[PDB]
Amino acid sequence: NKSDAAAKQIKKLEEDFDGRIGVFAIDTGSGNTFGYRSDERFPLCSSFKGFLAAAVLERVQQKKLDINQKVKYESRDLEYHSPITTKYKGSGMTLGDMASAALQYSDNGATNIIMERFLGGPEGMTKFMRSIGDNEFRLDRWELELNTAIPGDKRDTSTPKAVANSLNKLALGNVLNAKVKAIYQNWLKGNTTGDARIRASVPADWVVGDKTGSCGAYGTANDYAVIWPKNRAPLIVSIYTTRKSKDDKHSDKTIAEASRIAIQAID
């Protein structure tokens, strides 16, 4: 009933925006879920950076890395869309800060530096997600090529379901010990790029941690979220979208509406 009525609403919404909308949502209290195109491939865009940050945290927990270690890059020709790393090029950044900059501002310099030095490249990123039991996620390329979002390209894609599951395991499960889980959660809560997406879909008194992506082509954008309603157990919301032409812009409102619909479905 709720599930099928929500499916129709998403379907109407995808027609309205002339693209594809992928949704998976979990009510972690009741266990109810809702999925719309939840096993179809969508480009990760910058949304994988949320998991990159969690991979760094796991390495810290395992004492392979120090969260406070300086990361220097004074000669680097910094990638486009590096709002945070650009400013600290002079003096370097702690490993922790660089990871949270990749998360909270989608910093491209932070992302590539971390992947080249600490994570084993896209192959290493993919290995991390394999290790949490995520079999759909794949990172093939580096910044910024990973963002091309060409229809049919399976490079740098996952499914809404897998993203939902993996976020649940990482933010709420026991991949990260208690202490490092708390840091991850605080990182997600202070994300800056998601004001117009899932954060716009919920009451002002709910607490949200999220991670967005915006490929900047083929109207491809996404958001995933952990949501703490006031009186209840948390929700997991995962929204991914694509569009038909290269020049088509993404739609924050469509992502926010899709979230609204998904939350209703599981509520």
Active-site residues: which are they? 46, 145
As measured in angstroms, the least distance from the Cβ of 81 to ligand 4D6 is 4
- What phi, psi does 247 have (nearest 5°)? -90, -20
- Write out the residues near ligand 4D6 by the rule CB under 6 A: 45-46, 81, 106, 108, 144, 147, 193, 212-216
Nearer to ligand 4D6, 33 or 238 (CB): 238
Nearest-angstrom CA–CA distance, 65 and 52:
14
Report the C-alpha dihedral over residues 102, 107, 108, 110, rounded to 10 degrees. -50
User: Is 212 labelled as part of a ligand binding site?
Assistant: yes
User: Is 241 labelled as part of a ligand binding site?
Assistant: no
Nearer to ligand 4D6, 141 or 260 (CB): 141
Whether the CB-CB separation of 121 and 115 falls below 8 Å is answered with yes
Nearest-angstrom CA–CA distance, 263 and 89:
41
Listed in sequence order, the residues at least 6 apart from 221 whose beta carbon sits closer than 8 Å to its beta carbon are 45, 197, 212, 213, 214, 215, 241, 250, 251, 252, 255
User: Is 49 labelled as part of a ligand binding site?
Assistant: yes
As measured in angstroms, the least distance from the Cβ of 66 to ligand 4D6 is 27
As measured in angstroms, the least distance from the Cβ of 144 to ligand 4D6 is 5
- What phi, psi does 19 have (nearest 5°)? -155, -155
As measured in angstroms, the least distance from the Cβ of 184 to ligand 4D6 is 18
User: Is 46 labelled as part of a ligand binding site?
Assistant: yes
Cα distances (angstroms) measured from residue 169 to each of 27, 174, 219, 229: 14, 7, 29, 19
Nearer to ligand 4D6, 78 or 144 (CB): 144
Nearer to ligand 4D6, 46 or 159 (CB): 46
As measured in angstroms, the least distance from the Cβ of 11 to ligand 4D6 is 25
Nearer to ligand 4D6, 108 or 238 (CB): 108
Nearest-angstrom CA–CA distance, 157 and 30:
29
Amino acid at 189: K
**Which residue has the closest beta carbon to ligand 4D6?**
46
> Which amino acids are annotated as binding site for a beta-lactam, given as ranges?
46, 49, 106, 108, 212
